[PDB]
């Protein structure tokens with residue numbers, strides 16, 4: 325809550341999206357694994373629609389690279405102004421923006437349609453219509469008079485809920501809150517840390533609720549989802565680096581029903 | 582007739598060849614735009630990748646003939662040969678490769694071409710690994726003159742004879758006429774082992790191009806002239822494809838009408 329007030333976006337990016345965790349060359353790393361889950365999922369042609377919302381985007385865009393070719397209206401979100409500012413720096417190709425081009429290139433590699441990475445970034449930048457504040461603790465996380473088209477055909481969320489929740493029930497309630505944004509029959513792609521209890525973002529020291537795969541699954545069910553897919557990536561030693569205590573990463577593909 | 586004079590004009594004219602200007606003219610946009618799949622860059626990379634993907638072109642050693650200051654022509658090749666020789670007539674080109682080999686920032690940036698080859702080869706290789714492997718496999722950069730019967734000189738370093746040759750936009754760009762072109766092909770063919778493969782890329786119906794102050798003379802050749810010379814030199818032609826240069830890529834840096842790609846195997 326107040327902890328997120330010290331949250332340094334550049335320190336978070338550095339910690340998680342620069343070497344070693346950001347080395348995309350080795351297929352056995354977490355970056356490649358995440359992009360694979362995303363790419364494979366959309367390549368099924370079963371997650372489709374006009375509008376999409378990314379929950380708790382932070383200062384990162386990688387989580388939409390494969391998504392952006394299946395949704396013409398994309399909304400990004402975060403609780404922090406500084407994170408929203410950092411996104412704009414990349415959306416507007418402004419000065420000092422974070423360099424996502426390695427991830428773009430890899431999404432292009434993985435998707436295998438021979439797309440160049442610049443075309444990919446262009447499409448993402450074009451389809452992102454708005455960056456909005458959000459609080460998942462609020463039963464109406466986007467507030468009242470939201471410019472975002474509701475309900476969304478699909479949701480994506482990476483490393484948010486467990487990271488903003490003191491315990492299971494809060495995680496459960498947060499999942500309930502975002503779920504109200506999703507149209508019935510719609511899809512949620514959810515990615516997150518497994519059995520993590522803290523991580524660092526510069527001066528900020530954030531508390532995390534350690535969750536298991538089974539816990540994640542049960543929560544989705546409780547929230548009204550059929551779980552179509554749930555995979556775990558176990559975190560190799562070399563990617564365990566003092567910035568946190570994550571044990572694995574989960575990917576869930578859930579369908580509101 | 583007499584070979585010496587034409588060859589002499591050629592040598593003379595290349596003394597003004599400016600590598601950076603050439604790089605800019607041909608490998609920066611619009612020609613360097615790899616995003617449009619209908620462009621010449623992606624066509625060239627595709628010819629090479631697809632050819633190497635047959636698994637049919639392999640061995641220990643490969644020689645690139647008239648590399649100039651470019652490396653794109655070896656990106657797909659380099660997973661198939663442990664020993665690669667690069668070559669050029671001009672020291673300033675060889676220096677240019679020097680800069681890239683040393684991975685200096687001053688170097689021309691080939692990373693879009695590296696990524697694009699990774700993209701179409703379809704193995705999910707990252708571009709940094711592709712580049713690191715090319716840099717490792719290039720064992721030497723040698724002077725070369727294709728008008729000499731021994732284009733590498735006598736008692737050359739190169740492992741001869743090579744298992745394969747690559748050559749891009751060299752032969753036609755340094756030959757005053759068809760008979761000169763044919764002889765240059767004969768000369769480099771002495772470096773290839775029998776049963777070896779030659780991958781040849783070049784300009785079709787071009788008579789000139791610019792490389793700075795350098796406005797250089799090229800023999801215009803047709804696809805059929807290229808086919809006959811390969812046969813004349815003892816190759817079976819396995820593949821010969823033509824790219825027609827789109828109007829928007831016809832930028833006044835040359836009068837090229839198209840580009841040819843040939844896969845030929847030396848008889849024996």
Ligand SMILES: Nc1ncnc2c1ncn2[C@@H]1O[C@H](CSCC[C@H](N)C(=O)O)[C@@H](O)[C@H]1O
Nearest residue numbers: 380381382384403404459460482483484488
């Ligand atoms: N109460 C709240 N409601 C919604 N998002 C919140 C929140 N409190 C903090 N956040 C955001 O949750 C994010 C967790 S980390 C950023 C994750 C990013 N999507 C990526 O995958 O790396 C931070 O950006 C943080 O600012």
Ligand SMILES: Nc1ncnc2c1ncn2[C@@H]1O[C@H](CSCC[C@H](N)C(=O)O)[C@@H](O)[C@H]1O
Nearest residue numbers: 647648649670671725726727749750754755
């Ligand atoms: N007599 C000769 N024998 C062999 N190469 C020569 C030569 N005279 C000039 N060259 C080289 O022929 C090249 C033509 S430009 C082609 C460069 C590169 N292979 C690419 O694909 O773009 C220049 O590098 C030029 O210096």
Ligand SMILES: Nc1nccc2ccccc12
Nearest residue numbers: 340354483517523568570
């Ligand atoms: N453990 C963890 N927390 C937040 C973001 C991450 C991104 C990539 C790997 C691990 C992460």
Ligand SMILES: Nc1nccc2ccccc12
Nearest residue numbers: 607621750784790835837
């Ligand atoms: N080197 C060269 N000469 C004429 C036409 C070209 C077209 C595309 C790449 C290189 C070319």
